[PDB]
Nucleic acid binder design. Sequence first.
DNA 1: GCCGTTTTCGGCCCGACTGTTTTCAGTCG
Length: 572
Amino acid sequence: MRNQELARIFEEIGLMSEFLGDNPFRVRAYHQAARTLYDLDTPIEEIAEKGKEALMELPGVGPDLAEKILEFLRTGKVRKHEELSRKVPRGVLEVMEVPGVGPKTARLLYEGLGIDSLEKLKAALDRGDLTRLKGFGPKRAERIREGLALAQAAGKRRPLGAVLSLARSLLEAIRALPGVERAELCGSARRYKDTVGDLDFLVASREGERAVEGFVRLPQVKEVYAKGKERATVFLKNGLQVDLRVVPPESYGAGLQYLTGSKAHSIRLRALAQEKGLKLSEYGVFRGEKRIAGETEEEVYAALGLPWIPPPLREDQGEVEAALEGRLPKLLELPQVKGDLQVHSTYSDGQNTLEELWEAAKTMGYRYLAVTDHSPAVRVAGGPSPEEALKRVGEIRRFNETHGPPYLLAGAEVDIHPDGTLDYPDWVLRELDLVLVSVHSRFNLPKADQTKRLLKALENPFVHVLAHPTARLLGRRAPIEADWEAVFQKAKEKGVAVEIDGYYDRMDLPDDLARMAYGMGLWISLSTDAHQTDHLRFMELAVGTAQRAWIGPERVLNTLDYEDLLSWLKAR
DNA sequence: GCCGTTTTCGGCCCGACTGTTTTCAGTCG
Ligand SMILES: Nc1nc2c(ncn2[C@H]2CC[C@@H](COP(=O)(O)OP(=O)(O)OP(=O)(O)O)O2)c(=O)[nH]1
Ligand SMILES: [Mg+2]
Ligand SMILES: [Mg+2]
Ligand SMILES: [Zn+2]
């Protein structure tokens, strides 16, 4: 991938232009193209390999954001970006990333106190300079200090799974606040986006001041950036930004739509409303002053001539077009999943025994659970050897016969060597119920080699699932360089399923690689990669990722019952 | 700079919070 650089490059063209006072809509052309490319997990040049007049087609991208890309790879750099660089100091971009700052304030600060970096800004307030500026007051200076200090505690975006459980605690607390008729977790959290920038809570209330004052009073709250009658922005005792939005109960449905987004999806709907002479806000759909919809989401979407769109689809990735023409995808649902196909145990890196896993699986209402432990490669040991994997399969057999349902499947997560060979001999793989293969080494391999390595792993006829394929770690490590079309092509042809690993720091396949695979007709496997019984609660996230990728119950191994899973497995 | 089951040109989402703004601009979701 190289989206991460080019996402920053347009983001910079937009910001430098925004500083120079450019056409705001041209500015927004870049900002959007920045957001979609960074969110794009399928490598861009793999899509750009066919660009040309078909680059005029991509997503949120037109002809002008193409000849610049024609230029980009032809010459390594876009003149527009370089032209803007000469007019706008590199450090002013950093200053206007500070929440509350923006173009006009960054410019005033530059021409006023010559501030052109965070380091300089930091010095300016500590010294107390901005409280002297002509127009920039002492109150407006405290505003900057807030935003400057509050940008730091909230470091990176956080994986959804890292904050999920906390989010539900806060939700249950907000539902118990006086004045709160009804509350819900919206924003990116509700769309199951693999990472979040904050947590966005909507509240139905008729005494909104009470609820906001009640919300900020929660013990996890550390600071308050902004606080009004209807909304508040706060940061927790751990850095995580949390926003509250209050709306009257009559507009609850329009409030859910508003706070759930995405921005881009929301803008499609409002733009649509304009075509039909209507207005869409948080308060409802309106024809003139007459509110035609608001109480619920269903009827709000109906007001725009649309069926209800599930939150995970709301990324303006074709869900609106598919809603107009009445062909929304049928989506997987959590109760349809009848087991977890990658959990670990005390046999290797897990914290749990078979009894502990079985008990956890039964409690959740699972039909089965695959106990897949690491191959020797994880440590490179010689005893634990391949010999005693048979006794492990034997021990799990007797466990099933004595306990009954749910059933433990004897599995294994087998390392893929740098050449594509597997960490376990074939006779060991032959007698395993579930065989997962995955990469835990040599990530910097060139695209072509990493493809060959993966392809040879798929030629092994005992392989059932290709586990967390990209090998990424959210915040720690990028995806491996690989031609994923060829890899999914091969896996399909060999009947191997691709894994959506719901473990909080993996979330791999990502939504849009998952949507690609499933679109090609591949089978899918869902797991949590659990090392403690807590982790089994991540199935929700793999499902949500499945949902984001327009994936239904068809060709998903977890929706099969115990018997049908074994058939599928026993028939290689 | 994108973009068209009412458009290939003329628009481009809508409203809350903050500050020194006496009538609204800046920045944000
Ligand atoms: N109409 C409209 N809605 C917006 C705009 N910006 C944000 N929203 C809505 C959509 C989602 C909701 C929360 O905004 P966030 O900034 O939290 O974005 P998010 O979608 O939750 O993602 P993130 O994980 O980055 O927070 O507010 C906008 O410019 N216009
Ligand atoms: Mg959010
Ligand atoms: Mg937010
Ligand atoms: Zn693994």
